[PDB]
Design a binder for these strands. Structure first.
Length: 440
RNA sequence: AGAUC
């Protein structure tokens, strides 16, 4: 557990805090209180806006500068502790701006495999190793460890079963015979949709959660009766429930670079040990409620090295300036997840500026931004959005998607490099259309 | 799938 001696420079501490152990409400304030009392310049790194808002509740009264609109409180201007999201921190590292010499980094949910989160751990662990700072990584599943069944406040009954992944008419009575409340983790919104429809037809009250619907629907899980919550992995962080059962597909959808040539979003993919632990962690939370159950449908990924986020993290980190043109390494227990030599993706000054702007203003995925920038294309030159090979044609309602261009032409979307993330749902496609049209 | 400005 935490002790003030961990706040010394050159010290990286990983706090293994199992789900429900009090990471945010108990441990985080203890650390922050000690940093403030010693006026240690500190950044708290929240994985998401949702979690940042939860942190403010835990830290309320303590002087923290919240560098996210997810929180609105009155800053005094003398606070020595900053709070921001993982991605915000990494974005600011890429900008030609002053990022403080934080002497302490506190990273919540340090298993998070968002590319910005991975890159942040590399930067941070590198600064600690160089003796410039201390860091505390907090998570139920520290990088390098593979326990899908961590500790819990109450013992959990773990059972591997055949979990249905499509609507069913028979053969899975145990699903609907349950008289309690179930949280069901699915790999995609569309998959969730089908399962939810099946459950609703069977007379169940279902609430569905995903990034798109979370803000409104999660509140309903607190205020309405429900039999099932059918949720994507949005609920692996920042979400808790009063339930006695988790059903876990043990599957996910994550971007993968195919043949080094394009990015796909491919199913089926097994979840990681860390994600399985987060999912299971939704129950067994109350010592007064024994008997919670975790029903899971298969194994975890032996490795997630095929996930695009590892290479993308190195693309980010290769372009973050440290000192003297030094380049930070990935956090050691994670470093072998990418085989590229250190520096492989470092861009020269002008191409690097383009890469950064393509992500920050363009909202493009790291991999795609890198392709465009390394090709020597300028940020505002959108011709590449239309001159790919035919198999890169983007479809909308199974007919080719079209854009009115900056030059008043209606053209078919056909990007020179194909990244499935620019068109994987309506919002992504709308965003990419506006980019192709030169409108941001 | 998820994620920030």
């Amino acid at each position: 557990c935490f002790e003030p001696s961990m706040l010394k420079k050159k010290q990286l501490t990983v706090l293994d805090l199992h789900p429900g152990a009090g990471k945010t409400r108990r441990v985080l304030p203890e650390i922050v209180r000690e940093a403030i009392k010693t006026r240690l310049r500190t950044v708290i790194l929240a994985p998401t806006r949702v979690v940042a808002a939860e942190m403010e509740e835990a830290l309320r009264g303590l002087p923290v500068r919240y560098m996210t609109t997810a929180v609105n409180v009155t800053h005094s201007g003398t606070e020595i502790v900053d709070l921001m999201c993982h991605a915000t921190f990494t974005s600011r590292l890429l900008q030609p701006i002053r990022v403080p010499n934080y002497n302490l980094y506190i990273m919540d949910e340090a298993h998070f495999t968002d590319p910005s989160s991975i890159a942040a751990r590399g930067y941070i662990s590198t600064r600690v190793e160089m003796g410039e700072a201390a860091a505390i990584f907090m998570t139920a599943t520290p990088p390098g460890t593979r326990d899908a069944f961590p500790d819990s406040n109450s013992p959990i009954m773990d059972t591997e079963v055949e979990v249905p992944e499509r609507a069913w008419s028979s053969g899975f009575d145990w699903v609907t015979d349950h008289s309690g409340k179930t949280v069901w983790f699915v790999p995609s919104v569309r998959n969730g949709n089908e399962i939810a429809a099946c459950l609703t037809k069977a007379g169940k009250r279902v609430i569905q959660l995903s990034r798109k619907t979370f803000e409104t629907e999660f509140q309903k899980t607190k205020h309405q009766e429900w039999d099932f919550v059918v949720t994507t992995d949005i609920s692996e962080m920042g979400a808790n429930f009063k339930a006695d059962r988790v059903i876990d597909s043990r599957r996910c959808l994550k971007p993968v670079i195919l043949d080094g040539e394009r990015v796909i979003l491919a199913g089926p993919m097994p979840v990681t040990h860390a994600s399985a632990a987060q999912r299971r962690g939704r129950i067994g939370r109350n010592p007064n409620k024994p008997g919670d159950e975790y029903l899971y449908g298969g194994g975890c990924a032996e490795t997630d090295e095929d996930h695009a986020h590892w290479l993308e993290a190195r693309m980010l980190l290769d372009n973050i300036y440290l000192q003297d043109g030094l380049i930070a390494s990935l956090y050691r227990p994670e470093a072998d997840k990418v085989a590229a030599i250190e520096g492989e993706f470092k861009l020269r000054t002008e191409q690097r500026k383009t890469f950064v702007e393509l992500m920050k203003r363009g909202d493009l995925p790291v991999w795609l931004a890198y392709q465009v920038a390394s090709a020597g294309i300028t940020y505002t030159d959108r011709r590449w959005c239309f001159d790919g090979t035919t198999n890169n044609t983007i479809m909308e309602d199974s007919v080719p998607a079209e854009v009115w261009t900056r030059h008043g032409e209606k053209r078919v979307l056909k990007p020179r490099w194909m990244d499935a993330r620019v068109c994987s749902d309506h919002a992504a496609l709308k965003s990419f259309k506006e980019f192709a049209a030169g409108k941001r």
